[PDB]
Amino acid sequence: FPQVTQEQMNAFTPHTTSNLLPSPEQLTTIANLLVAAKVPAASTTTIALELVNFCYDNGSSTYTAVVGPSSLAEVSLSQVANIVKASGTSLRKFCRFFAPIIWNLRTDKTPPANWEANGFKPTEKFAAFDFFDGVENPAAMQPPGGLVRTPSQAERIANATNKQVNLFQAAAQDNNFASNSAFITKGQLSSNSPTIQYL
RNA sequence: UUUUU
């Protein structure tokens, strides 16, 4: 190895990606299938934003019942969300790409729908959506004039501590069985007692 | 990776 010199560390191409966002190769196998849904060529970020806006109020699980007709084309959201659930990228991974834009578009104006009953205090309610780690990412699509306001520390602590509570609501309903068969599960649906409801 | 109902 040639003991890197100054000219080499002065002629570096700065370029950052992240595995929390869908790979650049996956951003094309989505656009090519969107136009295949008769979607306009130029207006391809609008339809994706109109889905990020829906996952901002209901969530980004793979089990989210996406319902609603788009107001920008003749394509329904369900077939947009089902297109984006292909080629490997998860829905949440996709909404993470536009998180910095939905931040500007909706913060301090309209909170996520499911915060009154997701464990968020009223002051830190605008981080009440998953994929909130999309603004902690300089790789996601950034808004023209930067973010409206940086997330506060309270909001981050909340999104962290509430991310773990939900994981101990999903992982506390399933089992540590590694097979759905009737010989391993023995019929038991869950593998853990009601330590999954009480404190 | 897992945050819906």
Residue numbers in the entry: 5 to 203
Task: Quote the study's own text.
Helical virus particles can be either rigid rods, for example, tobacco mosaic virus (TMV, genus Tobamovirus, family Virgaviridae), or flexuous filaments, for example, potato virus X (PVX, genus Potexvirus, family Alphaflexiviridae). In each case the coat protein subunits are arranged with helical symmetry around the genomic RNA. Examination of the RNA content of AltMV and tobacco mosaic virus VLPs produced from pEff revealed the presence of vector-derived RNA sequences, suggesting that the replicating RNA acts as a scaffold for VLP assembly. Cryo-EM analysis of the AltMV VLPs showed they had a structure very similar to that of authentic potexvirus particles.
To determine whether the VLPs expressed from pEff are accurate mimics of the original virus structure, the structure of AltMV VLP was determined to 3.3 Å resolution. This revealed a left-handed helix, ~120 Å in diameter, comprising 8.8 coat proteins per helical turn with a helical twist of 41.1 degrees and a rise of 3.96 degrees. The density map was of sufficient quality to allow for unambiguous modelling of residues Phe5 to Leu203, and for the placement of five RNA residues per individual coat protein. Domain I takes the form of an extended arm-like structure, embracing the neighboring coat protein on the outer surface of the virion. Domain II makes up the core of the coat protein fold and comprises four alpha helices. Domain II is connected at its C-terminus via a long loop (107–155) to Domain III which comprises a single alpha helix (residues 156–177), and a C-terminal extension (residues 178–203).
